[PDB]
Design a protein around this ligand. Structure first.
Ligand SMILES: Cc1cc2nc3c(=O)[nH]c(=O)nc-3n(C[C@H](O)[C@H](O)[C@H](O)COP(=O)(O)O)c2cc1C
Ligand SMILES: Cc1cc2nc3c(=O)[nH]c(=O)nc-3n(C[C@H](O)[C@H](O)[C@H](O)COP(=O)(O)O)c2cc1C
Ligand SMILES: Cc1cc2nc3c(=O)[nH]c(=O)nc-3n(C[C@H](O)[C@H](O)[C@H](O)COP(=O)(O)O)c2cc1C
Ligand SMILES: Cc1cc2nc3c(=O)[nH]c(=O)nc-3n(C[C@H](O)[C@H](O)[C@H](O)COP(=O)(O)O)c2cc1C
Lengths: 316, 318, 313, 318
């Protein structure tokens, strides 16, 4: 569906980048620490993850694979647009069968707050038996896919539905959250921001690859906040909220770089998707590769753990 | 034979860019607005437009194609130069245009330098001949000198200044070698309605010119001389904090539109890219303008700007 | 192996670069001096060389060729790791009587080694100094012993030794903070061995996979030019070797220009080592005359005199 | 000779550049001046050139081409190294060049190294043997090294220092690896008439030297040591505010000519590229040259400058 674009099309950004190639890892030959004691263990949205990683949201055989990998690996998982479920409740025909203990994030999209209402959300979130809810905010994509294009007053509605019984994050989808995105999110009691930055998959470009099987407006589709900038920007404003770096953060090294710009967890999506198509055990491989690298990067930089990486980079 | 060249010759600047690509549109995911409510409507030169846009000067089936789209669309049109017009008034049967474009925005074209030859009266005769809403003198030394033109530009600002405020409103433009902060300085009193900065990055009139005079570009470098558009807008805006600014010079996509507006332009203007379109005629033109205009709207919306004045500021250095 | 990785595989850094190419030999046309008068002679680690230069650690037909060239041209040599030698004690100073042989251990071996073995290693081999190489990133990638806990402090006590000792990376470079860690220790030198040349992490991947599976990880490093710079703000006077793809004399000279007392090349010295001793010197002598000329062209009478003579391109 | 190195080698810098691509000409649409009044006339080393050009020092039938072109065109010219002449007593006669070029400004050159073995009195001799107008000593350590030629620049500048104010004017020039700021400081006291900063970015004498020895460049990187031209003009100017500077070395196009001019040069010089016209001879060298000046003029006209000196500062860092 979109599935065909992510899999088949040149949907990756063609000119913007995460910006992380702009930073270089401060390498610490004499840090006198031991691979050994670089500890990926990171708590998130109230479950203790085994490394600071979320399989990032994608859109029913695919999820099952990720879901098992998530379990096997003590990573976390966001869970496509539950958009359908909010008036098709037995399209829950759903992932906790293969993933009891894993951290599930249900994900929704701020816009849906305009049809649905608190209950609908408590009901979604338990429908999926998730641990938290991601609202995805996504104007460009939406604009581009000639889709529901009204983000007007979304934040107030979020604002007032607030401190919901489960954790809530706002994320973007890869055209990224700005400084001012964040000033808006500023005291909504959210549990997490996913900055979902520019650099990897462009939803814009995706959307158009569906409309025209090619990208008519290469350039619009590059609109966005390159992940590194977004981390930097968002953190500067929310010192305390846990930041998810996602958006073209496709290698664990890049991951560390991300961590070092002050982020907290990493998330991947499009790259995870093909593996997703040959089952967990494979996905599982991909992810644990990323963390094996990550660990190593963190070790190279003298960080004993993902939080200890803030600062450990300089402008290439 | 510039027409044959704009179409056949690689007359776009080869090494200079509008430098619009130095600039990141400051995308706002929680800008909190309805795309539905982003409003391109711009009042320009005493009329009112659907977009902040003008098709820009060319030089006359093409002319008709363009003026159609301009009427169809709620956008503006710089007529190509009526030098010939002034010269051969009978020949006056091209800018019929007004016929395919009754209420549209026609801007009359001339070239600051013709003012060595024409006067208040010749100007109005041009404006009426043409029946069009304003007059834009394009200044262009480097295009000139290359043309092996005439290429005396002394006193032109003041010759113009003194035949100031006319009947119709009046704008100064370049041909996309662009206007520097000092051009703008020179224009600081001249009661102009607009200034279009027409910077480098797009079609290099010098490069054109030579591709005519040789069918190749002999002095490549000479022909990248210019103030790149993003820079010119920037520049011309500090001098002229308010007077409307057109921004043209390979501002060939809606998104660069936005960047350009972001950096301080009030309107944008495409020319050469319209040319080929104005072969397959009027229809195809608007598909091109229309598309741009939509691209601009989304961008503007992605940037979190309700309408075009609202992007002043929404951009930053790559 | 590691060997034919360095030979067959593109193990050179693919993205990170030494940074030397971002520095301009401050040239000086009216420097006013004589090329004959430019003097490569440098005293290093209690001996004296005809050049500020070392052949670098490699991994006993090649060692022979190299060490030969070290005796002919009158330059340093760093022996490949004598880990094995410690291990299987019954297993080359005779090809190079009075040359500067620097013995190579590996900072992490102090995990199982102590002074005596250090001493024994220096002796069996016949050597003026001990250079301990540190390299976690290389290690971690070659899934290894990779406990680097307490290394410096261990060295620091086990130090003030009966010879010159030097610390040394392997091509991922030493940072301002590494130097810091080594600040207090009575070291004779540090060779900063920076990124931009051979990536020891690209080597170990090419060994595990014949490809570099994790490109990015393996570019992690401190580029040579900067390591010189950083190491040097910290260690204002200690001798410094600048190695890590300082593969031409002109770079030699910038390296020396940024803060280096001397230079050291390796991977590119290895193909010449295959064919043998002659060629090794044909290559170094050549480098050495490139360096003298450049040293000359920036108006530096001798290598001490190039500190200064460079700028951000 | 060396000849088809400069004819057939890749002897052009491969990586360092002139620097002039760093600079952007601040194009002035409304400078309001007239091609017409941009005047190349620039006096130099005593005689008045018709433009700020010197045909660069090169190396005997080639010399007659340039020399003539020189006259026709009003430009200066370095004769190549009086080398042989002053101790292979030889010719008036040969290379020449004054029979085919009477009025033209002829700079004769020599190379600070011969000061080692030529006496003040050998120099006056050379100069009139040649019937030249001034003397340029080229200083050229790096070339010299690469070439395994005479390598001893020890105390050449006091040698120049003591035998100074000579009857003809006298410039120090390098050859394309450029003079530094500190080069300049050494020249600061000598009563020179000019410097030719001769910078990196055009023809690399090391790569030349090397292409002789080896038919290829064995040490690319050496051969690139050098002060790029633009940096040399900035740097040398900063220290001899008053001396006429020749920007040469890579300044292969009037546009870059202007760029140099505006980085604070006064004169401009070309060699390597002049060399092959020098082979099809004097009339199409003229072509070359006059074209470069026809471009100089245009860019100067773009820039708002009425003459070469007025270009100073009329550039910005792109
Ligand atoms: C098939 C597929 C489906 C996706 N569906 C969603 C979605 O429903 N909501 C969302 O926010 N992001 C979706 N994404 C993208 C990621 O969640 C995320 O926005 C990311 O930042 C883009 O990919 P990358 O970060 O791994 O480069 C999808 C991606 C793919 C490949
Ligand atoms: C065929 C053609 C004819 C043109 N004629 C004129 C003209 O008569 N007067 C003028 O001021 N500009 C003329 N222009 C150029 C535009 O107004 C403007 O300089 C522009 O920035 C060049 O193309 P761009 O805007 O898409 O790069 C012409 C352009 C073309 C392509
Ligand atoms: C074949 C080979 C073998 C090596 N063996 C060792 C070794 O045993 N111990 C060590 O510390 N370094 C060893 N090195 C590291 C070099 O000293 C190192 O690559 C240098 O500081 C920078 O690399 P460059 O030669 O690319 O300048 C070896 C290198 C090569 C190429
Ligand atoms: C064929 C040729 C011969 C040359 N001969 C001399 C020479 O005898 N003496 C000298 O000082 N420079 C000589 N030059 C160099 C130029 O005079 C000058 O310094 C210049 O900067 C190098 O070429 P370019 O500037 O035109 O790139 C020669 C150049 C060429 C191309």
């Amino acid at each position: 569906k979109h599935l065909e674009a992510c899999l088949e099309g040149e949907v990756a950004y063609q000119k913007t980048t995460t910006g992380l190639e702009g930073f270089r890892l401060r390498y610490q030959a004499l840090a006198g620490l031991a691979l050994s004691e670089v500890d990926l263990t990171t708590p998130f949205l109230g479950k203790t993850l085994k490394a600071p990683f979320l399989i990032g949201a994608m859109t029913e055989r695919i999820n099952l694979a990720l879901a098992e990998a998530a379990e096997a690996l003590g990573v976390g998982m966001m869970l496509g647009s539950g958009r359908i479920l909010l008036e098709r409740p037995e399209a829950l025909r759903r992932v906790r069968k293969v993933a009891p203990k894993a951290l599930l994030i249900a994900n929704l999209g701020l816009a849906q707050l305009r049809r649905y209402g608190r209950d609908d959300l408590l009901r979604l979130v338990e429908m999926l038996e998730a641990d938290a809810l991601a609202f995805h905010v996504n104007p460009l994509q939406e604009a581009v896919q000639r889709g529901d294009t009204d983000f007007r007053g979304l934040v107030e509605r979020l604002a007032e539905l607030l401190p919901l019984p489960f954790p809530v994050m706002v994320k973007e989808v890869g055209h990224g959250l700005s400084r001012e995105a964040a000033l808006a999110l500023r005291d909504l009691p959210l549990a997490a921001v996913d900055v979902a930055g520019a650099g990897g998959t462009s939803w814009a470009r995706v959307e158009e690859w569906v409309r025209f099987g090619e990208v008519r407006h290469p350039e619009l589709c590059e609109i966005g906040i390159p992940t590194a900038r977004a981390i930097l920007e968002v953190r500067e404003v929310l010192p305390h909220l846990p930041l998810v770096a996602s958006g073209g953060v496709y290698t664990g090294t890049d991951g560390a770089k991300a961590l070092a710009l002050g982020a907290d967890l990493l998330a991947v999506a499009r790259p995870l998707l093909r593996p997703a198509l040959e089952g967990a055990e494979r996905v599982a491989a991909w992810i644990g590769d990323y963390l094996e690298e990550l660990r190593t990067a963190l070790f190279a930089i003298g960080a004993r753990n993902p939080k200890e990486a803030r600062g450990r980079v300089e402008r290439v």
